Amino acid sequence: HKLVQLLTTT
Amino acid sequence: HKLVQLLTTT
Amino acid sequence: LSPEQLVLTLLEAEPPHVLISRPSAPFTEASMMMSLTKLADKELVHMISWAKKIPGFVELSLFDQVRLLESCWMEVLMMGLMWRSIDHPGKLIFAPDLVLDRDEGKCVEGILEIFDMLLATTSRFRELKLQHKEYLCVKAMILLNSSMDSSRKLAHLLNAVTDALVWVIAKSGISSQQQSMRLANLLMLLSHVRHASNKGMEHLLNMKCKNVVPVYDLLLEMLN
Amino acid sequence: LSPEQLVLTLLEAEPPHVLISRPSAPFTEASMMMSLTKLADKELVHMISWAKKIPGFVELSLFDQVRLLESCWMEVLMMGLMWRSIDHPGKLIFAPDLVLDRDEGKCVEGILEIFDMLLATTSRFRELKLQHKEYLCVKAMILLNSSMDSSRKLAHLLNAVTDALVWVIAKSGISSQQQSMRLANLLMLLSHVRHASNKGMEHLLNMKCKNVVPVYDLLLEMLNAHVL
Ligand SMILES: N#Cc1cc(-c2ccc(O)c(F)c2)cc2ccc(O)cc12
Ligand SMILES: N#Cc1cc(-c2ccc(O)c(F)c2)cc2ccc(O)cc12
């Protein structure tokens, strides 16, 4: 889920 | 051998 | 040698189709693997002959010739395979009498995946409407670019074929801008061909360790 | 958006210069490998920010955004490594405080092979005198072309970046025939980058499995997802 959180946050 | 043969002997 | 002469030379050098008959009964992991290994072996022999026909190839050091072939043989096989399947959507034409269906890849553990991508890449070539002459140049470029002064001569050999590909695309008549885009589009697919080739050899290696099928003489040497 | 301004957005998407904060000193197998892994983890974070800055990337389905980054990450890192090392023959500039030589990769089994590949390919881009804008387009293409409606958006994006690379080359002013030739040579070198990438990942995977290098969260995730 790490890649996903960074893809969905700034 | 096989490869080398086909490249130079054939 | 002019670009056209190079293409003509490649055209004639095209290996003849290897004839392999589909097993009598429905495929089993063993029978299908027996079929693809025997075919690959036969095509490899023809590939070596094809290589010697690429202008300047036999001028390279024997060690470079070996190095290049050991490095891209499965890529070359799959490029030809996709070209053979270009006019048969949903089908993979390994040989005239060996037309494998996407579903048939199930009898073999992990090959379905590879079939999927082979078919997908083939469709892309279909979508791009790849032409025979472009195909010929690309397949040769695969061999010459697998660089994975003899090396100096290699660069020059590769540029010659590249020149030939540019010539072929120019002959299509499209605008210069479109010629560049097409050239790019064609070459950007080599990554996809390579990806399937990688998976293919990883699959072949794994199958060897599994004894699922015998592999040794020519295929074995190449595999290594 | 014109090709020139698309290239501008790629320039703007460039990750910052990364350092490992390591005091100068001889590299041992343990220090070298932990530094390489630590650097890769840091660059991965910056890589995700870069990707999201490429016009339209975040418009792709989350599934696509994820699959593209999971497949190309090591290739993107090594393409960056080659650009940074372009003006430094014989060296691999992983970072200002992580400069490695060929003989240094010898203290780690299987590494020398990879370094030789990285160095040779860097040398090729050097010969061709790879330009910064060309590097920018190629790097973006590596990401967008790793696709082994959302699908059309991607195709549109990849074509946009491809059109940008063609423009860059056209600006160099060289003959049309030399433009086609350069375009082909640049694209063909990508196969060599991809090759070194595959070997690089196999090496990392082995190190991870042996727990010889501390595998950070993000790096571990990217690694496992990719091999999977
Ligand atoms: N994927 C795949 C495989 C493809 C091929 C193969 C055979 C002939 C071709 O013209 C070709 F393009 C691929 C052979 C295999 C032999 C053993 C094996 O385990 C896998 C494979
Ligand atoms: N080859 C290689 C490896 C390269 C890299 C690596 C790190 C940062 C970069 O910008 C890059 F292009 C490659 C890390 C590794 C970490 C562990 C490992 O075992 C191998 C490697």
Coordinates of C-alpha atoms and ligand atoms in Angstrom, one line a residue:
Chain A
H1 CA 0.0 0.0 0.0
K2 CA 3.1 2.4 0.2
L3 CA 3.4 3.3 -3.4
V4 CA -0.4 3.8 -3.3
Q5 CA -0.3 6.3 -0.4
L6 CA 2.4 8.3 -2.2
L7 CA 0.4 8.2 -5.4
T8 CA -2.6 9.6 -3.5
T9 CA -0.9 12.3 -1.3
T10 CA 1.2 15.4 -1.9
Chain B
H1 CA 30.2 -26.8 -30.3
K2 CA 26.8 -27.0 -31.8
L3 CA 26.6 -23.2 -32.1
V4 CA 30.3 -22.8 -33.1
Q5 CA 30.0 -25.7 -35.6
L6 CA 26.9 -24.2 -37.3
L7 CA 28.5 -20.8 -37.5
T8 CA 31.9 -21.9 -38.9
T9 CA 31.6 -25.6 -40.0
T10 CA 28.3 -25.3 -41.8
Chain C
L1 CA 25.4 -1.9 -50.3
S2 CA 22.4 0.3 -50.8
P3 CA 19.4 0.3 -48.4
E4 CA 17.2 -1.5 -51.0
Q5 CA 19.9 -4.1 -51.6
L6 CA 20.2 -4.7 -47.9
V7 CA 16.4 -5.3 -47.6
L8 CA 16.4 -7.5 -50.7
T9 CA 19.3 -9.5 -49.1
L10 CA 17.3 -9.8 -45.9
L11 CA 14.2 -10.9 -47.8
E12 CA 16.0 -13.8 -49.5
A13 CA 17.7 -14.7 -46.2
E14 CA 14.4 -15.2 -44.5
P15 CA 14.4 -18.8 -43.2
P16 CA 11.9 -21.3 -44.7
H17 CA 9.1 -22.3 -42.4
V18 CA 9.8 -25.3 -40.1
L19 CA 7.2 -28.0 -40.4
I20 CA 6.1 -29.6 -37.1
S21 CA 3.0 -31.7 -36.7
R22 CA 0.5 -31.1 -33.9
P23 CA 0.3 -34.1 -31.6
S24 CA -2.4 -36.7 -32.3
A25 CA -4.2 -36.4 -28.9
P26 CA -5.1 -33.2 -27.0
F27 CA -2.0 -31.3 -25.7
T28 CA -0.6 -32.3 -22.3
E29 CA 2.1 -30.2 -20.6
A30 CA 4.6 -32.8 -21.9
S31 CA 3.4 -33.0 -25.5
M32 CA 3.1 -29.2 -25.9
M33 CA 6.6 -28.7 -24.3
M34 CA 7.9 -31.5 -26.6
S35 CA 6.4 -29.6 -29.5
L36 CA 7.8 -26.1 -28.7
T37 CA 11.3 -27.4 -27.8
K38 CA 11.7 -29.5 -30.9
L39 CA 10.4 -26.6 -33.0
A40 CA 12.7 -24.0 -31.3
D41 CA 15.7 -26.3 -31.9
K42 CA 14.8 -26.7 -35.6
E43 CA 14.4 -22.9 -36.0
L44 CA 17.6 -22.2 -34.2
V45 CA 19.5 -24.1 -36.9
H46 CA 17.8 -22.0 -39.5
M47 CA 18.5 -18.9 -37.5
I48 CA 22.2 -19.4 -37.6
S49 CA 22.1 -19.7 -41.4
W50 CA 20.0 -16.5 -41.5
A51 CA 22.6 -14.7 -39.4
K52 CA 25.4 -15.6 -41.7
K53 CA 23.4 -13.9 -44.5
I54 CA 23.1 -10.5 -42.7
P55 CA 25.7 -8.3 -44.5
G56 CA 28.9 -8.0 -42.5
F57 CA 27.8 -10.5 -39.8
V58 CA 30.4 -13.1 -40.7
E59 CA 33.0 -10.4 -40.7
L60 CA 32.6 -10.0 -36.9
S61 CA 34.8 -12.0 -34.5
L62 CA 33.4 -15.5 -33.9
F63 CA 33.1 -14.6 -30.3
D64 CA 30.9 -11.6 -31.1
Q65 CA 28.8 -13.7 -33.4
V66 CA 28.3 -16.3 -30.6
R67 CA 27.7 -13.6 -28.1
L68 CA 25.0 -11.9 -30.2
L69 CA 23.1 -15.1 -31.0
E70 CA 23.2 -16.5 -27.5
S71 CA 21.8 -13.1 -26.3
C72 CA 18.8 -12.7 -28.6
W73 CA 17.8 -16.0 -30.0
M74 CA 14.4 -16.3 -28.2
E75 CA 13.7 -12.7 -29.1
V76 CA 14.3 -13.4 -32.7
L77 CA 12.1 -16.5 -32.6
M78 CA 9.2 -14.6 -31.0
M79 CA 9.6 -11.7 -33.4
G80 CA 9.1 -14.2 -36.3
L81 CA 6.3 -15.9 -34.4
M82 CA 4.4 -12.7 -34.0
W83 CA 4.9 -11.9 -37.7
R84 CA 3.6 -15.3 -38.6
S85 CA 0.6 -14.7 -36.3
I86 CA 0.0 -11.1 -37.7
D87 CA -2.8 -12.3 -39.9
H88 CA -4.4 -14.7 -37.4
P89 CA -5.9 -12.7 -34.5
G90 CA -6.4 -14.7 -31.4
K91 CA -4.0 -17.3 -32.8
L92 CA -0.3 -18.0 -32.4
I93 CA 1.2 -19.6 -35.5
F94 CA 4.2 -21.5 -34.2
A95 CA 4.2 -23.5 -37.4
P96 CA 1.8 -24.2 -40.3
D97 CA 0.4 -27.3 -38.6
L98 CA 0.9 -26.0 -35.1
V99 CA -1.6 -23.3 -34.5
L100 CA -2.0 -22.7 -30.8
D101 CA -5.0 -21.1 -29.2
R102 CA -4.8 -18.8 -26.2
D103 CA -6.8 -21.3 -24.2
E104 CA -4.4 -24.2 -25.1
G105 CA -1.7 -22.5 -23.1
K106 CA -3.4 -23.7 -20.0
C107 CA -2.1 -27.3 -20.1
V108 CA 1.4 -25.8 -19.4
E109 CA 2.1 -24.2 -16.0
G110 CA 2.8 -20.5 -16.5
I111 CA 2.8 -20.4 -20.3
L112 CA -0.6 -18.8 -20.6
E113 CA 0.9 -15.5 -19.3
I114 CA 3.5 -15.6 -22.0
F115 CA 0.9 -16.4 -24.7
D116 CA -1.1 -13.4 -23.5
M117 CA 1.7 -11.0 -24.0
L118 CA 2.8 -12.6 -27.3
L119 CA -0.7 -12.1 -28.6
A120 CA -0.9 -8.6 -27.2
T121 CA 2.3 -7.5 -28.8
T122 CA 1.2 -9.2 -32.0
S123 CA -2.0 -7.1 -31.9
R124 CA 0.0 -4.0 -31.5
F125 CA 2.0 -4.8 -34.6
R126 CA -1.4 -5.5 -36.3
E127 CA -2.7 -2.1 -35.1
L128 CA 0.5 -0.5 -36.5
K129 CA 0.0 -2.4 -39.7
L130 CA 3.6 -3.6 -39.7
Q131 CA 4.9 -4.4 -43.2
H132 CA 7.0 -7.4 -44.3
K133 CA 10.0 -5.1 -45.2
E134 CA 9.9 -3.3 -41.9
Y135 CA 9.6 -6.7 -40.1
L136 CA 12.8 -7.9 -41.9
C137 CA 14.8 -4.9 -40.8
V138 CA 13.5 -5.0 -37.2
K139 CA 14.3 -8.7 -36.8
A140 CA 17.9 -8.1 -37.9
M141 CA 18.2 -5.0 -35.7
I142 CA 17.2 -7.2 -32.8
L143 CA 20.2 -9.5 -33.5
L144 CA 22.7 -6.6 -34.1
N145 CA 21.5 -4.5 -31.1
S146 CA 21.8 -7.4 -28.6
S147 CA 25.3 -6.0 -27.9
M148 CA 24.7 -7.6 -24.5
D149 CA 37.4 -2.9 -33.8
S150 CA 34.8 -5.7 -34.0
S151 CA 32.5 -3.7 -31.8
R152 CA 33.2 -0.7 -34.1
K153 CA 32.1 -2.8 -37.1
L154 CA 29.0 -3.9 -35.2
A155 CA 27.8 -0.3 -34.7
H156 CA 28.2 0.2 -38.5
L157 CA 26.4 -3.0 -39.3
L158 CA 23.5 -1.9 -37.1
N159 CA 23.3 1.5 -38.7
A160 CA 23.2 -0.1 -42.1
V161 CA 20.1 -2.0 -41.2
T162 CA 18.6 1.1 -39.5
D163 CA 19.3 3.0 -42.7
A164 CA 17.4 0.3 -44.5
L165 CA 14.4 0.6 -42.2
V166 CA 14.3 4.3 -42.6
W167 CA 14.4 3.7 -46.4
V168 CA 11.4 1.3 -46.2
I169 CA 9.3 3.7 -44.1
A170 CA 10.2 6.6 -46.5
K171 CA 8.9 4.4 -49.3
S172 CA 5.5 4.4 -47.6
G173 CA 5.1 8.0 -48.6
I174 CA 3.9 9.4 -45.3
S175 CA 5.2 12.8 -44.2
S176 CA 8.6 13.2 -42.7
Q177 CA 7.1 13.9 -39.3
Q178 CA 5.0 10.7 -39.6
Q179 CA 8.1 8.7 -40.8
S180 CA 9.8 9.6 -37.5
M181 CA 6.8 8.8 -35.4
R182 CA 6.4 5.4 -37.2
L183 CA 10.1 4.6 -36.7
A184 CA 9.7 5.3 -33.0
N185 CA 6.5 3.4 -32.7
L186 CA 8.1 0.3 -34.3
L187 CA 11.2 0.4 -32.2
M188 CA 9.4 1.0 -28.9
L189 CA 7.8 -2.4 -29.3
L190 CA 11.2 -4.2 -29.1
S191 CA 11.0 -3.8 -25.3
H192 CA 7.7 -5.7 -25.3
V193 CA 9.2 -8.4 -27.6
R194 CA 12.2 -8.6 -25.2
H195 CA 10.0 -8.8 -22.1
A196 CA 8.2 -11.9 -23.6
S197 CA 11.5 -13.3 -24.6
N198 CA 12.8 -12.9 -21.1
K199 CA 9.7 -14.6 -19.6
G200 CA 10.0 -17.3 -22.3
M201 CA 13.5 -18.3 -21.5
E202 CA 12.9 -18.1 -17.7
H203 CA 10.1 -20.5 -18.4
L204 CA 12.2 -22.8 -20.5
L205 CA 15.0 -22.8 -17.9
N206 CA 12.5 -23.6 -15.1
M207 CA 10.9 -26.4 -17.2
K208 CA 14.4 -27.9 -17.8
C209 CA 15.1 -28.1 -14.0
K210 CA 11.7 -29.7 -13.7
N211 CA 12.5 -32.4 -16.2
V212 CA 9.1 -31.7 -17.7
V213 CA 10.8 -32.3 -21.0
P214 CA 14.3 -33.1 -22.4
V215 CA 16.4 -30.2 -23.5
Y216 CA 20.1 -30.3 -24.2
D217 CA 22.0 -30.3 -27.4
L218 CA 21.5 -27.2 -29.3
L219 CA 18.7 -25.7 -27.1
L220 CA 20.7 -26.5 -24.0
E221 CA 23.8 -24.7 -25.2
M222 CA 21.7 -21.6 -26.1
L223 CA 19.8 -21.8 -22.9
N224 CA 22.9 -21.5 -20.8
Chain D
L1 CA 0.5 21.4 -25.6
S2 CA 3.4 21.8 -27.9
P3 CA 6.4 19.4 -27.8
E4 CA 8.5 22.2 -26.4
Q5 CA 6.2 22.9 -23.5
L6 CA 5.7 19.2 -22.8
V7 CA 9.5 18.8 -22.5
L8 CA 9.3 21.8 -20.1
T9 CA 6.9 20.0 -17.9
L10 CA 9.2 17.0 -17.8
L11 CA 12.1 19.3 -16.9
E12 CA 9.8 20.6 -14.1
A13 CA 9.0 17.1 -13.0
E14 CA 12.7 16.3 -12.4
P15 CA 13.5 14.9 -8.9
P16 CA 15.9 16.9 -6.8
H17 CA 19.5 15.9 -6.4
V18 CA 19.7 13.1 -3.8
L19 CA 22.5 12.4 -1.4
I20 CA 22.9 9.6 1.1
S21 CA 24.6 11.8 3.7
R22 CA 27.6 9.6 3.9
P23 CA 31.1 10.9 5.0
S24 CA 33.8 10.1 2.4
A25 CA 35.5 6.8 3.0
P26 CA 36.6 3.5 1.4
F27 CA 33.6 1.4 0.4
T28 CA 33.4 -2.2 1.8
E29 CA 30.9 -4.8 0.6
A30 CA 28.6 -3.9 3.5
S31 CA 28.8 -0.1 3.2
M32 CA 28.6 -0.1 -0.6
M33 CA 25.5 -2.3 -0.7
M34 CA 23.7 -0.6 2.1
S35 CA 24.4 2.7 0.5
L36 CA 23.1 1.5 -2.9
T37 CA 19.9 0.2 -1.3
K38 CA 19.4 3.2 0.9
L39 CA 19.9 5.5 -2.1
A40 CA 17.4 3.5 -4.2
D41 CA 14.8 3.8 -1.5
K42 CA 15.2 7.5 -1.3
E43 CA 15.1 7.9 -5.1
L44 CA 11.9 5.8 -5.3
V45 CA 10.0 8.3 -3.2
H46 CA 11.1 11.1 -5.5
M47 CA 10.3 8.9 -8.5
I48 CA 6.7 8.7 -7.6
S49 CA 6.5 12.5 -7.3
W50 CA 8.1 12.8 -10.7
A51 CA 5.6 10.5 -12.4
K52 CA 2.7 12.4 -10.9
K53 CA 4.1 15.6 -12.4
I54 CA 4.0 14.2 -16.0
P55 CA 0.9 15.7 -17.6
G56 CA -2.0 13.2 -17.5
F57 CA -0.2 10.5 -15.5
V58 CA -2.5 10.9 -12.5
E59 CA -5.5 10.8 -14.9
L60 CA -4.7 7.1 -15.5
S61 CA -6.4 4.5 -13.4
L62 CA -4.7 4.0 -10.1
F63 CA -4.2 0.4 -11.3
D64 CA -2.3 1.6 -14.3
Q65 CA -0.2 4.2 -12.4
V66 CA 0.8 1.4 -10.0
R67 CA 1.6 -1.3 -12.6
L68 CA 3.8 1.2 -14.7
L69 CA 5.9 2.2 -11.7
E70 CA 6.2 -1.3 -10.4
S71 CA 7.6 -2.6 -13.7
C72 CA 10.0 0.2 -14.7
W73 CA 11.4 1.6 -11.5
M74 CA 14.9 0.1 -11.7
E75 CA 15.1 1.0 -15.4
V76 CA 14.2 4.6 -14.5
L77 CA 16.8 4.7 -11.7
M78 CA 19.5 3.4 -14.0
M79 CA 18.6 5.8 -16.8
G80 CA 19.1 8.6 -14.3
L81 CA 22.4 7.1 -13.1
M82 CA 23.7 7.1 -16.7
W83 CA 22.8 10.8 -17.3
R84 CA 24.5 11.8 -14.1
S85 CA 27.6 9.7 -15.1
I86 CA 27.7 10.9 -18.7
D87 CA 30.4 13.6 -18.1
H88 CA 32.4 11.3 -15.8
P89 CA 34.1 8.6 -17.9
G90 CA 35.0 5.5 -15.9
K91 CA 32.7 6.3 -13.0
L92 CA 29.1 5.7 -11.9
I93 CA 27.7 8.7 -10.2
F94 CA 25.0 7.2 -8.0
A95 CA 25.1 10.4 -6.0
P96 CA 27.6 13.1 -5.1
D97 CA 28.6 11.1 -2.0
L98 CA 28.2 7.7 -3.8
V99 CA 30.7 7.6 -6.7
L100 CA 31.8 4.1 -7.6
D101 CA 34.5 2.7 -9.8
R102 CA 34.7 -0.6 -11.7
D103 CA 37.3 -2.1 -9.3
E104 CA 35.1 -1.3 -6.4
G105 CA 32.3 -3.4 -7.7
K106 CA 34.6 -6.3 -7.4
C107 CA 34.2 -6.7 -3.7
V108 CA 30.6 -7.7 -4.3
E109 CA 29.9 -10.9 -6.3
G110 CA 27.8 -10.3 -9.4
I111 CA 28.1 -6.6 -9.2
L112 CA 31.2 -6.0 -11.4
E113 CA 29.2 -7.5 -14.3
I114 CA 26.4 -5.1 -13.8
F115 CA 28.7 -2.0 -13.4
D116 CA 30.5 -3.0 -16.6
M117 CA 27.1 -2.9 -18.4
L118 CA 26.2 0.4 -16.8
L119 CA 29.5 1.9 -17.7
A120 CA 29.4 0.6 -21.3
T121 CA 25.9 1.9 -21.9
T122 CA 26.8 5.2 -20.4
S123 CA 29.7 5.3 -22.7
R124 CA 27.4 4.9 -25.7
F125 CA 25.1 7.8 -24.6
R126 CA 28.4 9.8 -24.2
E127 CA 29.5 9.0 -27.8
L128 CA 26.1 10.1 -29.1
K129 CA 26.4 13.1 -26.9
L130 CA 23.0 12.6 -25.3
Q131 CA 21.3 15.9 -24.6
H132 CA 19.4 16.8 -21.4
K133 CA 16.1 17.2 -23.1
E134 CA 16.6 13.8 -24.9
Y135 CA 17.3 12.2 -21.5
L136 CA 14.0 13.8 -20.2
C137 CA 11.9 12.3 -23.0
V138 CA 13.5 8.9 -22.9
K139 CA 13.1 8.6 -19.1
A140 CA 9.4 9.4 -19.4
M141 CA 9.1 6.9 -22.3
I142 CA 10.6 4.2 -20.2
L143 CA 7.8 4.7 -17.7
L144 CA 5.0 5.0 -20.2
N145 CA 6.2 2.2 -22.4
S146 CA 6.4 -0.4 -19.6
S147 CA 2.8 -1.6 -20.2
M148 CA 3.5 -5.4 -20.3
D149 CA -10.7 4.1 -21.2
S150 CA -7.4 4.2 -19.3
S151 CA -5.5 2.5 -22.0
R152 CA -6.1 5.1 -24.6
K153 CA -5.1 7.9 -22.2
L154 CA -1.8 6.0 -21.8
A155 CA -1.4 5.5 -25.5
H156 CA -2.1 9.3 -26.0
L157 CA 0.5 10.2 -23.3
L158 CA 3.2 7.9 -24.7
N159 CA 2.6 9.3 -28.2
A160 CA 2.8 12.8 -26.7
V161 CA 6.2 12.1 -25.2
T162 CA 7.4 10.3 -28.4
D163 CA 6.4 13.4 -30.4
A164 CA 8.4 15.4 -27.9
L165 CA 11.6 13.4 -28.4
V166 CA 11.3 13.7 -32.2
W167 CA 10.9 17.5 -31.7
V168 CA 14.1 17.7 -29.6
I169 CA 16.1 15.9 -32.2
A170 CA 14.6 18.1 -35.0
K171 CA 15.8 21.2 -33.1
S172 CA 19.4 20.0 -33.2
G173 CA 19.3 21.0 -36.8
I174 CA 21.0 17.9 -38.2
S175 CA 19.9 16.4 -41.5
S176 CA 16.6 14.5 -41.7
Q177 CA 18.5 11.2 -42.3
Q178 CA 20.7 11.8 -39.3
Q179 CA 17.6 12.7 -37.2
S180 CA 16.0 9.3 -38.0
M181 CA 19.3 7.6 -37.4
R182 CA 19.8 9.4 -34.0
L183 CA 16.2 8.6 -33.0
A184 CA 16.7 4.9 -33.7
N185 CA 20.1 4.8 -31.9
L186 CA 18.7 6.4 -28.8
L187 CA 15.7 4.1 -28.7
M188 CA 17.8 1.0 -29.3
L189 CA 20.0 1.9 -26.3
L190 CA 17.0 1.5 -24.1
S191 CA 17.2 -2.2 -24.6
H192 CA 20.6 -2.1 -23.0
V193 CA 19.3 0.0 -20.1
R194 CA 16.4 -2.5 -19.6
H195 CA 18.9 -5.4 -19.7
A196 CA 21.1 -3.9 -17.0
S197 CA 17.9 -3.2 -15.1
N198 CA 16.8 -6.8 -15.1
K199 CA 20.2 -7.9 -13.9
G200 CA 20.2 -5.2 -11.2
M201 CA 16.8 -6.4 -9.9
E202 CA 17.9 -10.0 -9.8
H203 CA 21.0 -8.9 -7.8
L204 CA 18.8 -6.9 -5.4
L205 CA 16.4 -9.7 -5.0
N206 CA 19.1 -12.1 -4.0
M207 CA 20.6 -9.7 -1.5
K208 CA 17.1 -9.2 0.0
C209 CA 16.5 -12.9 0.3
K210 CA 19.8 -13.2 2.1
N211 CA 19.1 -10.3 4.4
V212 CA 22.5 -8.9 3.7
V213 CA 21.1 -5.4 3.0
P214 CA 18.5 -3.6 5.0
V215 CA 15.5 -3.5 2.6
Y216 CA 13.4 -0.4 3.4
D217 CA 9.6 -0.5 3.1
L218 CA 9.2 1.2 -0.1
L219 CA 12.1 -0.6 -1.8
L220 CA 10.9 -3.9 -0.5
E221 CA 7.4 -3.2 -1.8
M222 CA 8.5 -2.2 -5.2
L223 CA 10.9 -5.1 -5.4
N224 CA 8.4 -7.8 -4.4
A225 CA 5.5 -6.4 -6.5
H226 CA 7.9 -6.3 -9.5
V227 CA 9.2 -9.8 -9.2
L228 CA 5.7 -11.0 -8.5
Ligands
LIG1 N1 7.0 -19.1 -23.5 C1 7.6 -19.8 -24.2 C2 8.3 -20.8 -25.1 C3 8.3 -20.4 -26.5 C4 9.0 -21.3 -27.5 C5 9.1 -20.9 -28.9 C6 9.2 -21.8 -30.0 C7 9.3 -21.5 -31.3 C8 9.2 -20.1 -31.7 O1 9.2 -19.8 -33.1 C9 9.0 -19.1 -30.7 F1 8.8 -17.8 -31.0 C10 8.9 -19.5 -29.3 C11 9.6 -22.5 -27.0 C12 9.6 -22.9 -25.6 C13 10.2 -24.1 -25.2 C14 10.1 -24.5 -23.8 C15 9.5 -23.6 -22.8 O2 9.4 -24.0 -21.5 C16 8.8 -22.4 -23.2 C17 8.9 -22.0 -24.6
LIG2 N1 23.2 -3.7 -9.9 C1 22.7 -3.1 -9.0 C2 22.1 -2.3 -8.0 C3 21.8 -1.0 -8.3 C4 21.2 -0.1 -7.4 C5 20.9 1.4 -7.7 C6 20.7 2.4 -6.8 C7 20.4 3.8 -7.1 C8 20.3 4.1 -8.5 O1 20.1 5.4 -8.9 C9 20.5 3.1 -9.5 F1 20.5 3.4 -10.8 C10 20.8 1.7 -9.1 C11 20.9 -0.6 -6.0 C12 21.1 -1.9 -5.7 C13 20.8 -2.4 -4.4 C14 21.1 -3.8 -4.0 C15 21.7 -4.6 -5.0 O2 22.0 -5.9 -4.6 C16 22.1 -4.2 -6.3 C17 21.8 -2.8 -6.7

